[PDB]
């Protein structure tokens, strides 16, 4: 499996339903042999430019290791979830377990 580095930011009005969103996503990962190597929640921090006339989005960090198709429905989960206002995926050369 490839390692990925999912970062997604959440609408501030759904910042309270952030940790409920996490174990929904881990069960998709861990339910298909996906090991998780970070979860570091960055809380709400102020955006450097207004996204959809919002500021202070809620940042999440993942650093998981899954097969290719397993994160593919996770990416389509992000497109139709209207509480996440953007999300980027990165990849391997390691599985990293560190801080900011």
């Amino acid at each position: 499996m490839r390692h990925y580095e999912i970062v997604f930011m959440v609408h501030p009005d759904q910042s309270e339903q952030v940790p409920g969103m996490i174990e929904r996503y881990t069960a998709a990962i861990t339910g298909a042999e996906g090991k998780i190597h970070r979860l570091e929640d960055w809380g709400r921090r102020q955006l450097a430019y207004p996204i959809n006339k919002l500021h202070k989005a809620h940042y999440v960090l993942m650093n998981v290791e899954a097969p290719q198709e397993v994160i593919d429905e996770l990416e389509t989960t992000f497109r139709f979830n209207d509480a996440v206002i953007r999300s980027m995926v990165m990849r391997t050369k390691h599985a990293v377990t560190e801080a900011s």
Binding site: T76, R79, F80, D82
Partner: protein, 271 residues
């Protein structure tokens, strides 16, 4: 799949058939057909109201589910099928309780695909949702205009409607014409675009190829005598009138829409 047929005859030379090998080569499903007699363009008074409608091939009507209101039950596309009443193809679907129905065929659809209506249906082509649940920006077809009425927009082949915005109670749709229309957000729509998208790439080739499709020859206005048309007459191919219909209203650019009833729902006209 468009195929340019080889010119072994005049009238066979310019034929491009669009042939789909996935259509069910067989008889259609029996309990979803009733008869559909032609009219020839004549109404109760028996007079030809719309011209150039004529013979054909005695085609039978197929009951197509346009409401798609059997909700929460999955359905499996049994086979695609040919339909002589549309430009699109139809797909005979089988619900889990044994009910068979005809629906329009979206683009990426084949036998074995699983579809579902209702609110909780997934975002996949063929699925039917109320438009307050479809994400804005999506590409839908078979769109209603009043909730529960049916499906009335984007039904022909290759046609689709893009959802542009959503003001809470209403949904703006960019229609295939280019007209941005408003519609109630509780109306259903089927995802994806309608299949058979290369229907426009066919050419008939023959005069008779149109003639067995139902149409009749359209004799031009300027060939008639002046008692028959507002054009017409002239010793030797004249024309000196502004072009009009046979009933004498301007035909090259004259806006005939006058409704004032559903004018509230049109954000921008076709351009």
């Amino acid at each position: 799949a468009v195929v340019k047929c080889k010119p072994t005859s005049p009238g066979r030379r310019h034929v491009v058939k669009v042939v789909n090998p996935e259509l069910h080569k067989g008889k259609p499903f029996a309990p979803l057909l009733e008869k559909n007699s032609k009219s020839g363009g004549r109404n109760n008074n028996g007079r030809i109201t719309t011209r150039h409608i004529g013979g054909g091939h005695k085609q039978a009507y197929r009951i197509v589910d346009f409401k798609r209101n059997k909700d929460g039950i999955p359905a499996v596309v049994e086979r695609l099928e040919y339909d002589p009443n549309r430009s699109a193809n139809i797909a005979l679907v089988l619900y889990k309780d044994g009910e068979r129905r005809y629906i329009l065929a979206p683009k990426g659809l084949k036998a074995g695909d699983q579809i579902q209506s209702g609110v909780d249906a997934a975002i996949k082509p063929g699925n039917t949702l109320p438009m307050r649940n479809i994400p804005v920006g999506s590409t839908v077809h078979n769109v209603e205009m009043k909730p529960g009425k049916g499906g009335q927009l984007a039904r022909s082949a290759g046609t689709y409607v893009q959802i542009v915005a959503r003001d809470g109670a209403y949904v703006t749709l960019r229609l295939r014409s280019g007209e941005m229309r408003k519609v109630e957000a509780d109306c259903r729509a089927t995802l994806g675009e309608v299949g058979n998208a290369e229907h426009m790439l066919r050419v008939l080739g023959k005069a008779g190829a149109a003639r067995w499709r139902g149409v009749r020859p359209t004799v031009r206005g300027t060939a008639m005598n002046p008692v028959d048309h507002p054009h017409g007459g002239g010793e030797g191919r004249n024309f000196g009138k502004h072009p009009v219909t046979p009933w004498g209203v301007q035909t090259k650019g004259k806006k005939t829409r006058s409704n004032k009833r559903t004018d509230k729902f049109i954000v921008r006209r076709r351009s």
